[PDB]
From a paper:
Pfs230 is the largest member of the 6-cysteine protein family with 14 consecutive 6-cysteine domains and is expressed on the surface of gametocytes and gametes. In P. falciparum, Pfs230-deficient males are unable to bind to red blood cells and establish exflagellation centers showing that Pfs230 is critical for fertilization and gamete fusion. The 6-cys domain is a β-sandwich fold formed by two β-sheets of mixed parallel and antiparallel β-strands, with typically six disulfide-bonded cysteines that are positionally conserved.
For Pfs230 D1D2 one molecule is present in the asymmetric unit with all residues defined except for 13 residues of a loop within the D2 domain and two residues at the C-terminus. The D1 domain of Pfs230 D1D2 folds into a three-on-four β-sandwich and as typical for A-type 6-cys domains, the first two β-strands are pinned together by a disulfide bond between C593 and C611. A short linker region connects the Pfs230 D1 domain with the D2 domain, which folds into a B-type 6-cys domain with disulfide bonds at C736–C781 and C804–C862. The orientation of the two domains towards each other is similar to tandem pairs of other 6-cys proteins such as Pf12, Pf41 and Pf12p, and is stabilized by several inter-domain contacts. In addition, our Pfs230 D1D2 structure highlights that the Pfs230 D1 domain is stable and well-folded without the prodomain. In contrast, LMIV230-01 did not form a complex with Pfs230 D1D2 showing that its extensive interactions with prodomain residues are critical for its binding to Pfs230.
Numbering used by the authors: 587 to 745, 759 to 887
């Protein structure tokens, strides 16, 4: 709902005479860019009722559980799903169950079925003859999507995670002798994305787009994609998500006008340099 699945255990786990029960939140994902949010009541948030609650993994959502043999074992979510977005904060609080909630946004493309788990377990809290419930989240991600319209600035000079970086975007750009600037061509309804270089220093994509018509007029006032294309969405626009130097964009179906835009990227260079180099990135929308 609203591209967000919520598992809210706030009112699911309190001790009752018939507890413990198992409260299972089943999240099934088969479409792009879904945000998953999990709320787990904190010990002490109500006087007695969560006194022995525990959440697993402690480092959720960075670390998740998967089922191996018959056991739940900890794995890094970013290794399970390339391009997944974990932001450091949720409403300006650490993205960690010690603040009561975690969130992450799944990417435009998932190649293989992936199933992982979180636990929010109040079944060891007792009060008189009551016991709390055991909360479990099962996230089942089905394969979905196809390559992302956009560009992957790849770390090698020429042509297990390196394989994903090379199959995820429609245009690959290698470090050495690049003769093809990134050109992301989108139409109404499309998802786009750029994996920015590992040694990126800064970029004006996509907060400072410059419109142009055939020839570049360097003086033209810049504007964000969100302000140029009403109801567009940019993901990880802060580029503060862990692991992946990526941004995604979505162009709404409502948007049927044509734009030609550019932004640019600066790399980390030897401090010996007097002159810095900005490399242009081209974005077109509904190019006729
Ligand atoms: C920018 O878009 C908003 C919201 O867009 C609407 O919802 C989308 C899902 C899509 O279906 C669009 O066709 C819609 O316009 C516009 O604001 C709204 O205007 C509509 C009139 O059609 C009205 O019914 C809504 O209640 C309004 N909602 C809000 C939050 O204002 C807004 O006018 C657009 N801005 C420009 C400059 O075009």
């Amino acid at each position: 709902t609203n591209k967000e699945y919520v598992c809210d255990f706030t009112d699911q786990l309190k001790p009752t005479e018939s507890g413990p029960k198992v409260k299972k939140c089943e999240v099934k994902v088969n479409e792009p860019l879904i945000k998953v949010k999990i709320i787990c009541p904190l010990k002490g948030s109500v006087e007695k009722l969560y006194d022995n609650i525990e959440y697993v993994p402690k480092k959720s959502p960075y670390v998740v559980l998967t089922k191996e043999e018959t056991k739940l074992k900890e794995k890094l979510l970013s290794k399970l799903i390339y391009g997944l977005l974990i932001s450091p904060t949720v409403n300006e609080k650490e993205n960690n169950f010690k603040e009561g909630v975690i969130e992450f946004t799944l990417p435009p493309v998932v190649h293989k079925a992936t199933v992982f788990y979180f636990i929010c377990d109040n079944s060891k809290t007792e009060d008189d003859n009551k016991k709390g419930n055991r909360g479990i989240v099962e996230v089942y991600v089905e394969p979905y999507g196809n390559k992302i319209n956009g560009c992957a600035f790849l770390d090698e000079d020429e042509e297990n995670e390196k394989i994903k970086m090379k199959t995820f975007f429609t245009q690959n750009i290698y470090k050495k002798n690049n003769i093809y600037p990134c050109y992301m061509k989108l139409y109404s309804g499309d998802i786009g994305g750029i994996l920015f270089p590992k040694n990126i220093k800064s970029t004006t994509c996509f907060e400072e787009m410059i419109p142009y018509n055939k020839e570049i007029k360097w003086n033209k006032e810049n504007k964000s994609l969100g302000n140029l294309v009403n109801n567009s969405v940019v993901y990880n626009k802060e580029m503060n998500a862990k692991y992946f130097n990526v941004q995604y964009v979505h162009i709404p179906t409502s948007y049927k006008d044509t734009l030609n835009l550019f932004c640019s990227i600066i790399l980390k260079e030897e401090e010996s340099n007097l002159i810095s180099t900005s490399y242009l990135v081209y974005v077109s929308i509904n190019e006729e």
